[PDB]
Symmetry: D2
Subunit: 439 residues, 4 copies
């Protein structure tokens, strides 16, 4: 019972579909896929017989392998591939003793492990990107629906000038659209790893002709990209995954702290989909991943410093944090879809909250309107003293302005009601939402 990893300590991903893509047996399967695709590619190239490739492929199934034994024998070589290869070789030998000779021919641990890593990453990135696309669809709908829903723009925790929830949602959309675009691009460029014992491919084998044939076949068999050079110590793919997962988690973290700001008791402008404590749990889960993935990504970025032809530790430090980043970001993406899809916007509570500073939140809109008649510098100086006196006498900004002798008869009454209305001073928030949505 002590082997089960249920997501007990990580509810942001527990029960979400990324768990099955990136669990230990999924990695074991990915490593078997890499082995079988290698023998298939070597067969298509002519270095081994097709019947051997067919038999190895048929045996390359996690169900044929003892996961716990493979994982526990890894301490002998610091990686699981030697144990895996021996287990796969016996499974093929049971059925086809001639094929077993061809398991793992000319190959090395890192080719199989890193190729499996990139296969797990490609499959997890497909899920992450599909969820990000779902989030973006919901966010674009929020952004269009609420183009004209006024609310208090908040800077450094205080009301500043009014804005629109549509504009805020378009910013959420911008981040999510950006992350989904990078996830898809990174997914299409993840490479296989075919290098041999020290990156010369000596074991797999005019020379340019057979290299390009084997590289083109291994790309076909794996579906992964063909890289310029073996990358056993050129860890660009891992640093890229590090970067796009930390960006994705951070972007989703941005939505999460925004929802928490808007969802708190004193504000109550939004609510997450549902004693009588409806805690914002979805944003809490997204945030919990955002406070984890960047630190994990930094450890992954440092592994670019990989010495010689295979690092004695820095490569080994990559596997678990890479799996965690995929897992946490995948959970956060799924959670963000749920959050964006079910978010409840309370437009009336937003309008009401605009009145909380007693007109101070429009005092830059009023300064602009008075500038033709007072001058820029004098209008600002006049609104500053009013905003302080209103924030002393407990009166509204309109009340205090209506007692300044400098202002008598300066505007028709109907125009004063229009100027003091926070719901009208939204700048060009509307034109910004359209340009965002036209893209």
């Amino acid at each position: 019972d002590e082997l089960l990893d249920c997501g007990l300590l990580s509810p942001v991903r527990a029960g979400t579909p990324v768990e099955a893509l990136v669990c230990d047996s999924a990695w074991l399967q990915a490593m078997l896929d890499a082995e079988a695709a290698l023998t298939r590619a070597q067969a298509r190239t002519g270095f081994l017989p097709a019947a051997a490739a067919e038999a190895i492929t048929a045996a390359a199934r996690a169900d044929r392998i003892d996961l716990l034994a493979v994982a526990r024998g890894a301490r002998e070589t610091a990686n699981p591939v030697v144990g895996l290869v021996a287990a796969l070789t016996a499974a093929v030998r049971r059925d086809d003793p001639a094929a077993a000779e061809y398991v793992h021919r000319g190959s090395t641990s890192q080719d199989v492990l890193d190729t499996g890593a990139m296969l797990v990453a490609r499959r997890a990135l497909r899920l992450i990107g599909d969820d990000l696309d779902r989030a973006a669809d919901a966010l674009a709908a929020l952004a269009a629906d609420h183009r004209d829903t006024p609310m208090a723009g908040r800077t450094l925790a205080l009301h500043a000038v009014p804005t629109t929830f549509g504009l805020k949602a378009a910013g959420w959309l911008e981040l999510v659209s950006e992350a989904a675009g990078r996830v898809a691009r990174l997914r299409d460029g993840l490479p296989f790893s075919l290098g041999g014992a020290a990156g010369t491919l000596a074991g797999y084998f005019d020379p340019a002709v057979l290299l390009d044939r084997l590289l083109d076949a291994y790309a076909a068999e794996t579906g992964l990209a063909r890289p310029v050079l073996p990358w056993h110590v050129l860890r660009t793919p891992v640093a890229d995954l590090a970067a796009v997962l930390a960006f994705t988690a951070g972007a989703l973290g941005k939505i999460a702290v925004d929802v928490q700001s808007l969802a708190r008791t004193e504000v109550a402008e939004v609510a997450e989909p549902a004693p009588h404590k409806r805690n914002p749990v979805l944003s809490t889960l997204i945030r919990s991943a955002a406070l984890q993935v960047p630190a994990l990504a930094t450890g992954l970025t440092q592994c670019l410093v990989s010495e010689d032809e295979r690092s004695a530790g820095a490569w080994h430090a990559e596997w678990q944090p890479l799996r965690e980043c995929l897992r946490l970001t995948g959970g956060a993406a799924r959670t963000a879809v749920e959050l964006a899809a079910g978010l409840e916007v309370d437009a009336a509570r937003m309008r009401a909250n605009l009145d909380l500073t007693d007109g101070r939140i429009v005092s830059e809109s009023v300064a602009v309107a008075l500038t033709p008649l007072l001058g820029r510098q004098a209008a600002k100086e006049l609104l500053t003293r009013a905003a302080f006196t209103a924030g002393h006498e407990g009166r509204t900004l309109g009340e205090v302005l209506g007692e300044l002798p400098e202002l008598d008869g300066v505007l028709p009454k109907e125009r004063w009601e229009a100027l003091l209305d926070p719901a009208r001073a939204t700048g060009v928030a509307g034109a910004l939402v359209d340009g965002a949505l036209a893209r």
Copy 2:
């Protein structure tokens, strides 16, 4: 088959005893322990009947609970305790319907989860500290045995002056002894968490009298420390665990990169215990943890920034990285015991490597010996030109010194053989090892 976490991606801890202390079901058990100890402490205080405490305790067993259901229901509240409490309540109800009313009385999720966290940490720290003590015993034996084993001190990757492997091992010992001392001190000071819904303990209940009685009983029932204040947002214990685990992993990482420097093909002064490639896998595993725990610790330290009376995410970000730190550091400690216990020191290869700079490595010892007869500044200037000319004419430093007219007749021949012997110029490395070992 997709729930098994076997350590496939983390061989530094796979198969080591810390895995069972800190796996998901161990945390579930720790949380049940915290619940049962709370009811026992409330019974000893008088707030509930002892038979209820006895029945709750007997039901508070991981085998009575569905781990996967608890973990997957946590998405509803962002933590597993509500689901756990409901599962424990049904288990007690099957046997004793009056006791079930008392499960989780007056309590809150964070009291149970954090108390379980500190119980897991205390038990894992006991194992980590015991292994560190075993490493230190082996290191002290290496340090004593090799007090006089000369070798090249290396600075910025080049031979500098000679030293002793005993001195180097005493530095390893110093780090390990330091980490083991902090692990034991932190272990004795980990506190329970008894705060109630927002840290006032309103649900658990002249006032100073019943507080101190309940606090003293909960400390007795858990064996954990009693803290001054509820620490739901005073995350000192977690930051402390963060700090001592990152220090421990880093210290062990220091031994690991040293072994790798000494174990490489061109050096071969040590070997790890055992085609014909005996890779230093133990140091590789220790190093892999050292490249992971500090990044994880930094995420844990940032959670000190926990807003209000319970953070909406920063507390949630603590559980998985804390479990990983305990797990990776525990594996690294176990691996370090194996490395220190079986390390093979090749004293003759150390002596031979001292000769690789053709005497240049003793040219500060020779400058010291010539200073009475040449002057400090002139002896240094004279050894500099010799060390360059020897590093040009391909001759030894002794050969080049034997042609300088300034040096003719300056020392008896027997004294020249003594000065040029790298094995004698070890400074006070011997007296340093003794002082280290006297402590």
Copy 3:
């Protein structure tokens, strides 16, 4: 004009006294102090003449040295000490040509640089600890004054149960008191660095007798601690500074996000000391450091992985992040003193905000009071439905309870007013503040 570092990009420390302790010329001075104290200690031990020590000491003044030349010549050896030593040697030579021979005798770059580092750290830690003590005095006064000032405890961004600002301030005090205690302890244990070229002290020189005399004198001349072993690659002091600075910054970050939560427009329970936008700038500055020091500390912790007898890079990576940590934490400490000293608590706005959930915030206090008459499980179930119906019909919790037939005549009216008063349901917050303040 391009050499000035004014704190333009780091307002949290600009203009604060820690800037002068840890600027480049302060480090140059600290390194000169380390040199001069070494010659003084070697003179007290008998290895050089006292007049040479007196002359070197008198020349060991930053004003006698070209800072920019020293800093720019460091690229030749990757550290400034060789250039510094040459500059100090000429300054002493101008006055006393016999003393100049004794500058830097038997020594090495790292002894001087790390000793200077620990001197800068000791002096900066004295300032940091003194400010933390000032913050703690103000916080203890806030905690005592507001022992009985009721306010809404907030968990996961929502009102939970009532608490007291006194309790919250006592938690702030707890963190600050803890950090100030560690800063002072670390300050008293910072060691000097006296190791020689590779940690054997060969250049500085029965053997145990002269070692202990030189070590005891260097401790006297520097005022720093004597360590068991040279620590050129045993980076415990740097990791300790890393840990206590990140803890300190994080603890202060906790106060800062709390103030921001309480200071926002919709809450307005506190204000920082002072158009009409009084942004919480002090908490913003403290927070900006809290989001920087932990990442810097993690880089410093990783340098525990220092290979051989002197690392070719990991030691060099320590200086700038260590200086930044001291600088940012020092600014944050000074800023926190200002924040704690001038914080404005609005007790009436706290009381008023308690009413925002229309009684829901007391529904656990009411469940406790009804338990003798309804049962624990039934009282909770009854308050849950009321809290939902009140959060639907827009009525208070008292209103909805007054229509449940189960509750008719259950309590005198006077007792209902007492139960529904949020200002009375503060648990044992009062007894917690006293215990905190008794320590």
Copy 4:
């Protein structure tokens, strides 16, 4: 004298040209550039008179501003722009009192600061990319020259199979070419910041018409990119800089640890350009930055979590780490150019080191050659026992193979000399270098 930042603690960038691009006065200048370009763009759009734009531009010079006063007044608002604007306004007022009214019209602190940030970043990225291009030119020459220079491939610190220094240098080239490509792309896409007080641009002003005219003019006046939306809390540009600087530093760190591995005393296959201790200082400096920038980048990535319309701290945490990343990576780039340009390759010492395992390093090449005559599985099993017996009897691998009865007469003597020659078993390293160089 206490304001000078000379690079005393950071020799990797001291004296390098990036220091002047990113020092405090360069940022002050960049912020003045942003102000002046805004008034110019508002003039080209028609919102203010051109003579005012000309006068503001002429006054917008760091020499007209007190840097220290601006930096020290920032504590009042937590950023320097209010103080800067007041200083610029007086400078323009001295000459042209009508223009002074137009300084900073409709604008906000973050527009100016972030636009200045992106200007500093664009100018520093131009330098970083130009140096990376210089490094890549030198690396491509090393890669071509040494296409056929055999050397020991090293995996997990031990000889594995032979490779070529040309192949290794092509991997260095791959990383540097990749980083230089991303630096140039990021440089072309850095955006200006024009958002107004809360991202609605209310102060700067059918609506889509004037927005696009002002945005198109501000892009022209700054030379920066036009973004879809104001990005005051959409911190994609900063996270991108974070990512590409950490990648760049890490890639250069890879070259640095490789040089250190090859440059150490026992190996001596390369030397950096130049008693008799030629420490690898350039690689030490590059490495010191690689151990700093990733941690700094992680703090910068976390600031994607920026709440509301302007964060109360997370934006403020960006400036100093962003400047440090540009500064350290710029120094590392310059240092890497020097390292790649002057690197000394010792081809003969590489060939000699191939013999250190007494033929074991070719035992996979020999297994391949014997496979037609023994079988794959039996050839491997036969070379394993030989490699162990050779690593016991102290004999070469050829010697031990020449006594196995299974091998008698299996190959002509001339073919045995060819098989046992480490310089011939380089796999397809040659064809890999060409493909790398064709790109």
